[model samples]
Target: EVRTIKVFTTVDNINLHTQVVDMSMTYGQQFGPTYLDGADVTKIKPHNSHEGKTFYVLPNDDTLRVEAFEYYHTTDPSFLGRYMSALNHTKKWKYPQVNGLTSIKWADNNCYLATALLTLQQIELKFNPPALQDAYYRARAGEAANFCALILAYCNKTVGELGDVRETMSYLFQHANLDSCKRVLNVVCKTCGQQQTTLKGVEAVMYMGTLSYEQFKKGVQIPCTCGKQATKYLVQQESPFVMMSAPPAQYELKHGTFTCASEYTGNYQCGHYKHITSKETLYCIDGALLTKSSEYKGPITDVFYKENSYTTTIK
Candidate 1:
């Protein structure tokens, strides 16, 4: 038979104040129906939070530029898509194009060698070609040669001379060897060339890092793209705040009812917690349960998980 289980809080009669602050920050608003009346807003802190959701690292207008342009020809992953959107939306203060170029050169060149080695293995697998069959002969010699050329072009900045790096990158589109590509590219990006030559990986990360650094040095300033004062304020401040706050501890999360074991004490209370049973009709903090309201109310709704039970305790 299915059992209806309940939970109880580990610490009896703890201050709900901290929870409220956490909730407010997570929902991005003050407490309302969701929180208990007169809930002490100052006491709340994020219970168990993931750093990514808490703060915006890149500025509002500042973008976390990744080199989507470079890899769009190859496989396009979901994560890369989201990152590109994020990069575009935020304020971008700068682009270390020079550093990016260095990394691109080293990674592409090295990846050529790695790809060649892997091709030899693939050839062996395909036709079971004799081991002594001269590594080059064992592999698709024609394709391998072309592949090497592409890498050389990328590494030596001859990509432009090859009639658009975009077209040259297309050759990799048919290649589905992320492991080999990554292995070679990673080494070149991380260890080859000057400090700037370490941009291995998709261009987006390098763009984000370089642009973010530029934005940080420039200070919190977003050029007004919109005329509305509110929009302008959000653009200038909200964008930068989110970008700058991408580091640790600048933000927190609040869960209306359900809590996870990953929480602060590495424990959580479970119950028919109304929040979980109900769809999240409102906004919620990252990596948290549903919250009912947008406003910050002191001790917002007494609804919370207590160990394995749902309990109502108001301060």
Candidate 2:
């Protein structure tokens, strides 16, 4: 059965630092076993075993504060062991493949070349050697100009908005005239939804002033105010005003007679007029003439006359 064992290392030449390690062949082969008293043990043991345990000693060069989680200890006996040990010491160790070369060698060679390049650039910058001066100036000018150009194009200006390009160019232009390489680049408007160090003196100011004056002549506004106007105006001519009319009045006819009755007492004439004489005389008891009349003389003699019919107009 696999069991957990604690491995301790000494720090500050006084205190002991311990961590748990699994006592299994897989774990022992990966991280060397601190115990040589067989792989399995039931009790704690001192670090007096001679089975190549002497290499596990803390180095005397410096009092290194090795963090527990960031470091791994390996005891593989090969050239690869050195690489593995170095790799285990750092958390960011990578085994990047380069060409057909072994990963460890490739990584080491790359580190060497990177250090060389760092030193070369530093020395070139410091001494300004004539052999490297032209090429270095060309490369630096290209880089600085490219950076400034990209930023200017994105901000919709010939120059930058936050003045980063100006600061960078002030130092960079000392080596080469990168300012002459001009090209028409697309400018981004401010309303478009879409979602360093160095200083020269008054000469830099004079340079910036001249550059800004040229840009002003070309009508370039920084912090661009490109947006839409949202207000509208309407012009209307005035005419003479007239009052509105009132609503029409409603009327209804009440009880009105088309023909006059014989009992009518009003002074108005009858709608229909005629003389009517019958054996039974209908007297105008209300003092108004009858509207229609008929005359009969014992059914033997008869005479009839029709008065002109009239219609009374009611307002």
Candidate 3:
């Protein structure tokens, strides 16, 4: 009987993305010593593409690329011996995603306060005083940071406190410093049999940056050095490819006290003349040098990469 070889690949669930098992059936020593002596080396040569040059990516910083490689005649006269040689080429193959930690970036957190100022103005126009109508519009309006502070400063100068113009729960949200949003991520590849890469939870406070709530419904993703075309998909090989659960964590203004003080001259004030001498000076203390740190896990999804993007899917 002549020699015929067909190969197949299987990914182990228990091992997950850890290892890729290569398998095949039929044939007898097609390359090594087992090959019949009657066969001519020129007429019957081994043709496993795996015999070609194989490579592994290095650390995130090291970007040495060898796009092309060639194959060499094998002196080793054993199947496994040749396979072992092939294995050596993939040594320390980290799924391109496993290279390093990526961070979440969004400046939306600060914007809430700005929007809050806008809302207060709307309330003032409808309830409190017309003077507070364009109060925030007069001060400034931009990203978030100083925008809200600028408006608050203006209010302190022209008006007193805004205790009279409020939306109840709105006040509690103003001091929001979203925190403890610790989250994690894991990604794998399809083309290369490899282990999943991990992304540790970075405090949500630092990532307070978001379109908030709805912004999160869309999910998070990052890139991998390997080409996305070869990366795995959410549903591949007839099962969930990647496994992850990130419900998103949160931090709030808890157990914090704002020493009794309501400078606004209104009957429905928050405090009862609290503190010896306290002015609703919410903005007078406009200084600088201010700077700025998640935990929740949920969702079962397959994480991978694509030609144009990093991808994931829900099961």
TM-score per model over all chains: 0.15, 0.15, 0.18
TM-score, cand. 1 vs. native: 0.15
For 1-315, candidate 2 gives per-residue lDDT tens digits of 656555553312134445555544333343343222112222333332322232132232233223211122212223122222332322122322222111111122122121122112222122121212432343233222222222222223332122222232233333332222222112334356211112122231222211122232233333434553221111111111101111111211111211111111112221211111222332111112222223211111111111122221211
RMSD of each: 31.6, 48.6, 30.0
Candidate 1 residue runs with Cα over 4 Å from true position: 1-144, 150-224, 227-315
107-134, model 3: which lDDT tens digit per residue? 2222222223333322211212222222
Off by over 4 Å in 3: 1-113, 116-147, 150-179, 192-222, 229-315
Task: For residues 1-315, write the lDDT of model 1, one tens digit per residue.
Answer: 322212111111121122223332522243221211112222343333421222211111111222222222222333222332322321121211121111111221232233223322221112121111222241244223323333333333232122222222223322322221110111112123211122122221111111122233333322232432210001011110111112111112243332211111111221111111112332322112234443222211111121211111211
Clashes of each: 45, 4, 14
Top model number, lDDT: 2
Weakest 10 consecutive residues of candidate 1 by summed lDDT = 231-240
